[PDB]
Symmetry: C6
Subunit: 200 residues, 6 copies
Amino acid sequence: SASFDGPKFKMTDGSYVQTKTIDVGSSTDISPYLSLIREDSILNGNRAVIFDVYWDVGFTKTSGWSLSSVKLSTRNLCLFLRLPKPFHDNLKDLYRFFASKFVTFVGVQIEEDLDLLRENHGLVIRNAINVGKLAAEARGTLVLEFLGTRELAHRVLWSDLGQLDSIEAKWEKAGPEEQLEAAAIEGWLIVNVWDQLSDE
Amino acid sequence: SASFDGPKFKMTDGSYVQTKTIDVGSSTDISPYLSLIREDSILNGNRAVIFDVYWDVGFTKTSGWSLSSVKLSTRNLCLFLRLPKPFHDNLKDLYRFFASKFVTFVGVQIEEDLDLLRENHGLVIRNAINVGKLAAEARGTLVLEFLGTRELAHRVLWSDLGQLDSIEAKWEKAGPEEQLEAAAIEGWLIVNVWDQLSDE
Amino acid sequence: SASFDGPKFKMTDGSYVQTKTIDVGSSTDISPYLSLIREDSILNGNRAVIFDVYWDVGFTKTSGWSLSSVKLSTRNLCLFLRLPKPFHDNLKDLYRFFASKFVTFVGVQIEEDLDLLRENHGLVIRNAINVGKLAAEARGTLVLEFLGTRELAHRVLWSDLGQLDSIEAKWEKAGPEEQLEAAAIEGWLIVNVWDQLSDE
Amino acid sequence: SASFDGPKFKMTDGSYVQTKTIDVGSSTDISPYLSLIREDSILNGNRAVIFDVYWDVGFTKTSGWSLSSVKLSTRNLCLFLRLPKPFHDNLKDLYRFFASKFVTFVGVQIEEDLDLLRENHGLVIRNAINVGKLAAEARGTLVLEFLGTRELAHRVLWSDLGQLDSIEAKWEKAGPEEQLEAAAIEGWLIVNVWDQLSDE
Amino acid sequence: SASFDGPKFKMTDGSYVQTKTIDVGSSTDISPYLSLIREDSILNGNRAVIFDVYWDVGFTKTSGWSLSSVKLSTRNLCLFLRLPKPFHDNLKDLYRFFASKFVTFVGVQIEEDLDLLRENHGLVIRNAINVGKLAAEARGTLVLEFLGTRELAHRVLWSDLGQLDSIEAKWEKAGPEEQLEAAAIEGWLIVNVWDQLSDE
Amino acid sequence: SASFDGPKFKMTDGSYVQTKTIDVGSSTDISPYLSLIREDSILNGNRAVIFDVYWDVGFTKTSGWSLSSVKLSTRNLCLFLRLPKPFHDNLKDLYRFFASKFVTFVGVQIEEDLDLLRENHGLVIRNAINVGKLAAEARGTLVLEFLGTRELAHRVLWSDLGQLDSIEAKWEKAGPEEQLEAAAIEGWLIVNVWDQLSDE
């Protein structure tokens, strides 16, 4: 079965985030995990999917960058996909999913990521939003456009970030589970950022 | 006579949308069905045609995307065209239809769609509107620009979408007629979004 | 010699449009008819020439499109030029005419038109306006920028459009004469839209 | 030495304009006349040189257009240069003059012109202004951005244009002297348009 | 036991900036130094890292600019990385650090620098801010966008800059240790600029 | 010694500008003059270096333009550099100087210049401002954006320009010393324009 059976993390408001990490090879089917993210976004998440992307920088000069991980978060769930190089056709499901108009893909500082995706992979996100910009405009606070994930969450929600900070402050030491925890937390924070702004 | 004799769907307001689905070959003549769409738009639909487009992702990096379906909706009708690869001359009628200045082509999150259509197929929509941005500006609510089809309808119309949600929440398991039902509902919803915006 | 001796149409306000349709061969001198359009625009029409362009869609993916005809409308005149493929030298006068700063070329939804003209035919309109945007601004009505010919004329002039609609609603069943009629009427309508806007 | 020894024209305000026309061939020395335009602009014209450019259209699709005339007008003068195809080294002086920051080059509908000039001839105008857009912003009248030479003068200066209209209405029938006259009058008008915007 | 054990400098407010200069070779590990920068920014700097870059100009005409060194500043620390000609794999740490969304990279007059980094090295800073622009907008003082490092510090902070000026005035005769001092001072100045703008 | 021992000009207000003109060959060291310009800017001229550039025009079509003089002005100095074609390596010092963030390079109508420098020479000015746009926005006077050097100074400062006017009106007849004189006066005028705008 497909379930989010990696570690659960408890957020500062007492809620839990269920997690799943997949190493995608040439024949891994991620489609059932993408379906759960989508189903959860529609039933429970007001049709947002919060995301982040990670690159393997390879030695035109940015051509060498290749997408090595994708995080997809909803209120309840965090799916972390580790991707191979190169892609095989099983990754067509990720492309079809990122092109969907069922949900909005919400990210932080994604302007360059979107060009890299399109130019290096032909991956297109039809319904994306770079959320600092919306935050800045909704709040009339110009600097929110220029904040990283933690700091945007801080200036929008003012919640406790002590756990997230202590992991990030020592990132090079942090184990794979603590890195996953930091990713899951940031996903939840941005989920909350978005719920806050889309209702204001 | 050419008619929309496919499944009929009843909208939350009690109206009935008539559908037609066409599998376009090398020979299908789609002319009579585009004429019906055009006629209903002019006579009953205030010269709006609502649309959506569906791509087959093939692997310059976006140049492998190929348009695999097109939806065209008016209040009364929903024409769904499944298209081949490559196109044959009989699809010239569709290029001519989409170039028309008789009606306005209303879409949701179509900015990338327009560029792919243009770059990959030479298909030009001379009179299009990416409807979310007009919504945000008319209603003075920034977030509307960044919403997918369902959620835009929700935030502009505040009508009941339980049926729509239930189908899309289980997309990968929905049969073709349910998926058509969802396409027809979304068509009708954005028709109503447009009618509400053009007039206010 | 030269004159607008084609069909003459009566507009809803009782005025008339004279028309002329020429099949441009390799030999045709179109200068005299261009001269009459320019004369009528300067002496009677406040130096507006209203225009529309009609494409043969052919199979850079848009580089297949070919200018099949041009409509030029003034106060009293509608000239319809049907063009060959490829163009001959005698079409140089149309290039000079369209480049003129004596008059403003007023069109509806011409942004893509102008790109296709320049890219495919090296045809440059130095003094063009895509008139819906001016309408929208001049009048604080956002949707006008995104309307087609008929609906823009409707929303700006509020005049009788029953006859135009009946021809357009069944475009496919319209003879060359009724299609010319619709073109003449739309030309006349957009002359009026322009006269009206240029005073606000 | 060299002087503006062609016809002189009376303007509707009772001033005069002196005129010079030259057909430039490979040995022509135009520098004495540019120095006169420059001197008159600096001492008499508040450092504006009004201009227009004229193209031999030609079979990338616009790369065959070639600059065929240039007009330079000041307070008192109007210099009309007819150019060869191709240019010779003696035209270097025109390139340098057009690059000067001693004066502002004030033009009407020159956006495509500037692109053609750069791309086809490498001619750069470092200090140029497409004056209808400044007219529109300065006056808060949107339409001024979208007007031709005569019409923009009409709508800023509201002066008598019967003479200019009579020539341009019959343009195809006007002799070279009458064409020169219209160029000189339009030069004078945009001079006065400029005076009106700059100290507003 | 990595530590910032190069020269330390006393700022005008009595605080001390500790520095470290690394000559990066084919095998140097810089991750412990970057980690100290990141740790200090998160725990003490509110997630800002101030930066500047230094180019070797070489003789696509800008393709010969080569990145020679980079400075990364927090209030407490200033790291200088002196870069080799062939970057090896050990420099990927730097690419990943500059790509981070944990912190915001704050620079002065960095628009060209970002294009050059991207074009010549494939180095992308996903979360960057050209701080002069924010200061101009924040303070409503237009000229701030167009100031160099010292002058922006002056116009925002009004602190004593005699020591900095004295080194910069004689820049070519200042030895490497004073040039290093000037760089550390400017890093501290801009940290201070940012701390004002980010929550005032 | 490196000193500004060319003609010294007295300005309208009793201040003086010292000049130096250098015919840069393949071997000339210009760095002691650059250091003098930078020192003066830092110590006495509020970190502005006013500049202008002069092109040898060329027969892509603008790729033949070649930089032939550069003028650099400060509070007290005007350096005028005449460059060879092609450059040799001794000009790397000028590329370094122009990339400095110690000062602001203030220019009048330099938008095309910056593009030609980059495209043709790979010369990058990291901290440049096209000052007319700042003047227009600062002063709420639209037309300043479109003025050449003298007229901008006039409209910002309102000082006496008879001497400058007298030389430029007869530019083709002025000796090399009178042309320097004009270049020096223009430098001093924009220095003052900048000091004035810097305070608003």
